[PDB]
């Protein structure tokens, strides 16, 4: 028993992290086969980050302008190209540690593990959710850029996130591994703000299931609700609408606990109205929304990689 | 910016995890050079669990009674010895993935990462703290035994915990890597209860210092306290007594913020007195006690 914010094992991704230097800018790169991926803003000088012309800056640089270090070994860059907001450096050597991998774009509410790195060196791993406003509540200091988010499914690493920037509100913004930003952000030192966030309702319900599975039952009540009645109340409290998709996805947990989803919706509705009345759920005084249904079944079933 | 409960990268420990089987019992082992370390209770049957005579069970074992399996490879056991509650299997292959390592015994309030494993395969990694009552609030199912807790310092892995059992309150007990239990627990399936748990006061203060560094001051007050008056109040909320040692440890955070340790103690008294009144500190509506003074300086500016 027990319930923790649990990250994927980072071993396969630690094998891929390199240091990328262009002039005075150092940050992190992802070395897969004979390409290194990193944020395109590595080419920017102080003056440039305000209104950079990336295509302009890029064409003016020789391969030797990119210093790529895998531990003590310098990699020789034999090509460079842009793809949206990620720079792709072609190197002479395939990464012998390249895992089975895929680039995947994730939906809001979906969780991943972040491997925080500094000078191409893995520092820490944590579990995140893509917020509905396309930000992540990360922990990133100077030099964190190029740090990646991933999921594992058997032996396949799904890279979903590369870190680019921090928003003034202390939350974080980045791209998929094809350089497409998550959310309405641009890689420029101009002023940007995260939209107002909402709570991932399907994730809160999965976390209440995890509570019941661990013997925390006090919030269960005799009632049932409907999606409409639940969703009408939910919107009020800035809660994502619960779609029928969501109700089907909880089916395993519902069947495994004996608590039907629309019964659990009535328990969550009451929690939104009255709060938790000086009580905790799994030692939390807040309603936790960074666990997916699949995260709950995986931790509670002991799925390995 | 940001403040996350963060674990160490698990790669160096993943490289060391194996499956250890003895009779019908399978759990996880830790393979370092030519020794596999695992919980000695791998040699128990069902019946053996209440009053196992470990010395009696072990003399009856051959090296070839132990199946060790690193991925496909079955390792060959060329020696077995017990040390306290840890079985040590000598094998004929040094682990090539062996990192720089050392074994360390941690004190209550110290944090570490856990690589939860089943059948020598990792399920996931999370961050923990040795509770004052010498338990951990882990996430551990059947077959999790031999999963380890660790810290990483540059490229050196400090192993500090190996998992052995779950107490009736749903909390976890285990040993250092020399096989000595943390706390008064024994590797028998006998009635055992955790002592009443307390909050790790020094960690909460560190976390309040973290909140200030991250720019939140709402909970500061114009008061100070004596160490003694602080502890008299704190204990009424089941907080660990704060020692002069704890005060010395908090020195650097005190300096960085310019807030005296005993002023920060004054804020905690008030918070204990008032709660948070719909507010949060670093995104928590509870006071966080699983960040050490060291963890805060490591993760903050
Ligand atoms: C990459 N190593 C850093 C990571 C930062 C450092 C502090 N926390 C992080 O996540 N990324 C950057 O320096 C990017 C980079 C220019 C500006 N930038 C920022 O993160 C800045 N943010 C913004 O300009 C804002 F708010 F508009 F999003 C900063 C103010 C320094 C936090 C570029 C090219 C976007
Ligand atoms: C190792 N794979 C398990 C890990 C357990 C299983 C459930 N969650 C865990 O952390 N270890 C054990 O099964 C140990 C083992 C015998 C009994 N045991 C227990 O964890 C049991 N608890 C106790 O005996 C108690 F309460 F005293 F700690 C159990 C009832 C199965 C939870 C030995 C040798 C202690």
DSSP string of A257-283, one letter each residue: HS--HHHHHHHHHHHHHH--TT--BTT
> Quick one: tokens of A272?
């939104």
CA distance B275 to B273: 6
A71 lines ligand 1 (CB under 6 A): no
CA distance B157 to B298: 17
Q: Which of A16, A117, A145, A300 is catalytic?
A: A145
> Quick one: tokens of B70?
């690193």
Which residues in chain B touch residue A300, judged by CB atoms under 8 angstroms apart?
A: 141
Q: Check residue A46 and report its DSSP letter.
A: G
CA distance A289 to B32: 39
Altogether, the residues listed in chain A come to a count of 305
Q: Which of A9, A283, A300 sits opposite B10 (nearest CB)?
A: A9
* Exp. method: X-ray
Least Cα distance to A55 among A36, A80, A31 occurs for: A80
> From the candidates B8, B11, B26, B197, which should be mutated to test the interface with A, based on the most A CB atoms within 10 A?
B11
The CATH fold assigned to A11-91 is Thrombin, subunit H (2.40.10)
Decide if B128 is catalytic: no
> Quick one: tokens of A297?
């079944």
A39 lines ligand 1 (CB under 6 A): no
Please, are residues A145 and A28 in contact by the beta-carbon 8 Å criterion? yes
Host H or E run for residue B14: helix B11-14
A139 lines ligand 1 (CB under 6 A): no
Least Cα distance to A233 among A267, A197, A280 occurs for: A267
CA distance A227 to A241: 9
Least Cα distance to B179 among B11, B35, B48 occurs for: B35
Q: Nearest 5 degrees, angle CA A6-CA A8-CA A11? A: 135
> Where on the phi/psi map is residue A232: left (φ > 0), alpha (ψ -120 to 50), or beta?
alpha
* Residue among B165, B175, B190 whose CB has most ligand 2 atoms within 8 A, to mutate: B165
Q: Which residues contact A123 (CB under 8 A, 6 or more apart)?
A: A116, A117, B9
Burial class (CB in 10 A: 0-12, 13-18, 19+), B244: exposed
A interface residues, B as partner, C-beta within 8 Å: 1-12, 14-15, 115-116, 122-126, 137-141, 166, 170-172, 214-215, 280, 283-286, 298-305
Q: Which of B22, B145, B265, B300 is catalytic?
A: B145
Altogether, the residues listed in chain B come to a count of 301
* Biggest distance spanned by C-alpha atoms of chain A: 69
Which segments of A219-260 does DSSP mark as H helices, in order?
A: 227-236, 244-249, 251-257
A176 lines ligand 1 (CB under 6 A): no
CA distance A141 to B182: 35
> Which of the following CATH numbers is that of domain A201-301: 1.10.10.10, 3.40.50.200, 1.10.1840.10, 3.30.830.10?
1.10.1840.10
Burial class (CB in 10 A: 0-12, 13-18, 19+), B96: exposed
Burial class (CB in 10 A: 0-12, 13-18, 19+), B131: buried
Least Cα distance to B32 among B85, B89, B72 occurs for: B89
At A90 the three-state DSSP class reads strand
CA distance B233 to B10: 40
Decide if B41 is catalytic: yes
CA distance B229 to B221: 16
DSSP symbols for B245-301 = HHHHHTHHHHHHHT--HHHHHHHHHHHHHH--TT--BTTBSS---S--HHHHHHH--
CA distance A116 to A162: 10
CA A122 from centre of chain? 16
Least Cα distance to A34 among A85, A79, A87, A101 occurs for: A79
CA distance A185 to A136: 13
The CATH fold assigned to B201-299 is main proteinase (3clpro) structure, domain 3 (1.10.1840)
Least Cα distance to B89 among B69, B65, B63 occurs for: B63
> Where on the phi/psi map is residue A63: left (φ > 0), alpha (ψ -120 to 50), or beta?
alpha
Beta bridge partners, B91, equal: B77
CB B79: neighbour CB atoms within 10 A? 12
What resolution (Å)?
2.0
């Amino acid at each position: 028993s027990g319930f923790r914010k649990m990250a994927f094992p980072s071993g396969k991704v630690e094998g891929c992290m390199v240091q990328v230097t262009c002039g005075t800018t150092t940050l992190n790169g992802l070395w897969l086969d004979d390409v290194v991926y990193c944020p395109r803003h590595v080419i920017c000088t102080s003056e440039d980050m305000l209104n950079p012309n990336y295509e302009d800056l890029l064409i003016r640089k020789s391969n030797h302008n990119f210093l790529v270090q895998a531990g003590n070994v310098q990699l020789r860059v034999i090509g460079h190209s842009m793809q949206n907001c990620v720079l792709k450096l072609k190197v002479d050597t395939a990464n012998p540690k390249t895992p089975k991998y895929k680039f995947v774009r994730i939906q809001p509410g979906q969780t991943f593990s972040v491997l925080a790195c500094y000078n191409g060196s893995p520092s820490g791993v944590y579990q995140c959710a893509m917020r509905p406003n396309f930000t992540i509540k990360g922990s990133f200091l100077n030099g964190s850029c190029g740090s990646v988010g991933f999921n594992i499914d058997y032996d396949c690493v799904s890279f979903c996130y590369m870190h680019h920037m921090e928003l003034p509100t202390g939350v974080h913004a980045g791209t998929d591994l094809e350089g497409n930003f998550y959310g309405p952000f641009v890689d420029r030192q101009t002023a940007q703000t995260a939209g107002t966030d909402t709570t991932i309702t399907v994730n809160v319900l999965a976390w209440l299931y995890a509570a019941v599975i661990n013997g925390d039952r006090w919030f269960l009540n005799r009632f049932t609700t409907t999606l409409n009645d639940f969703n009408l109340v939910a919107m009020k409290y800035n809660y994502e609408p619960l779609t029928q998709d969501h109700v089907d996805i909880l089916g395993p947990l519902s069947a495994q606990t004996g608590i039907a989803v629309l019964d659990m919706c009535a328990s969550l509705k009451e929690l939104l109205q009255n709060g938790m009345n000086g009580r905790t759920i799994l030692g939390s005084a807040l309603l936790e929304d960074e666990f997916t249904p699949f995260d709950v079944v995986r931790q509670c079933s002991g799925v390995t990689f």
